Design a binder for these strands. Structure first.
Ligand SMILES: [Cl-]
Ligand SMILES: [Mg+2]
Lengths: 195, 197
DNA sequence: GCTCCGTGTGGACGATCGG
DNA sequence: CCGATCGTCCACACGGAG
């Protein structure tokens, strides 16, 4: 169906949901002890704390001041990576969409990524596995779902567009501007309430 | 490059001051209507000849016009892109509609196949691999160039939600969370954009 | 006239899933 | 048989130097 209540815009101005920002999404929570979020909702993989791959990447992440090209929960708090990627999506000339799809990766970034899916249970990286993040730089969606932070959905939506092969460079730039306009008031209102 | 976090962005005040140099309702830089007798197709500025007279286009147009629902496989020959955008946008806000599942796994009838094959034949034969730019990640969603030509950023919701729906990295509950995130973000934008235009 | 660089695009082909 | 995403590799433009 389609009414004049929709084409005029009044149906969207009255949008309300039963969820509360800052409250856990139904079924979402922290991973079991000694494990980190991975895969589908509620799933997890063993952590790689003390492993050479995780610790080498943790030091590089803490020393760069930039968002990590390959992120894992062993590297730090997901809120830091979410905020760095979110800010990156709003800085002009940053090439955020190109960086989300094809970031420059040192061998340590490759070794970290290979260790995470291997310790989960995978023999090789495969396009069919549900990981909870379409781009390796974006933290697992379960951390946004557990914290009830809908503004962290922007990182995943922008990365899903960036990772798609069906849009060219100029088309992705328009979609990034669309997402900037949509999420800017949400992020401003959400970051104020939870600070 | 490098990103500097600070209290201006952590408190949210950097996002409250967001402004861009674009104007809603005005063409995106480099974007415009297709040439006469052609429809938008492929990358930015590209186009293919229209099929407004072919039997495949007319069969699908009647099915679209007789259902009152958005077409599962859409082409410019079926009607106004703005109407299909509005139907998909309304569908994305409809409870119990299974919108993400429908975007990812639509029913494709023989008439849809004949329409889709007629569109690629009237263009050039580029396919020899699976990597090709279409301008829309889901066939039900009109070409992005129509949103770019009209400067309608609210029509980006249909493409952003469809890109999530087609991704293989999220399960059903994760895609449901992302739809709610996109609903909240775009609801004030759509309300404000539909009023001005 | 060839290469040499880094870097930024899209294509090619396969793995895996599924109608 | 068809085709979807996405890992992985690669083709090519960029241009002042030899
Ligand atoms: Cl709320
Ligand atoms: Mg066949």
């Amino acid at each position: 169906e389609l009414d004049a209540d929709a084409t005029s815009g009044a149906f969207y101005a009255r949008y309300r949901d039963g969820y509360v920002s800052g409250e856990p999404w139904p079924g979402a929570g922290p991973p079991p002890p000694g494990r980190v979020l991975y895969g589908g909702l509620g799933d997890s993989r063993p952590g790689l704390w003390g492993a050479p791959e995780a610790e080498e990447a943790r030091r590089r992440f803490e020393a760069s001041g930039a968002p990590a090209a390959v992120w894992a929960p062993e590297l730090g708090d997901a809120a830091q990576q979410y905020a760095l990627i979110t800010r990156l999506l709003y800085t002009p000339d940053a090439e955020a969409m190109g960086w989300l799809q094809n970031p420059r990766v040192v061998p340590g970034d490759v070794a970290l990524d290979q260790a995470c899916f291997r310790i989960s249970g995978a023999a090789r990286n495969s396009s069919s596995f549900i990981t909870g993040s379409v781009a390796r730089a974006v933290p697992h969606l379960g951390y946004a779902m557990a914290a009830g932070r809908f503004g962290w959905g922007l990182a995943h939506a922008a990365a899903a567009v960036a990772m798609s092969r069906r849009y060219d460079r100029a088309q992705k730039g328009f979609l990034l501007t669309s997402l900037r306009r949509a999420y800017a008031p949400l992020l401003a209102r959400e970051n104020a309430a939870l600070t």
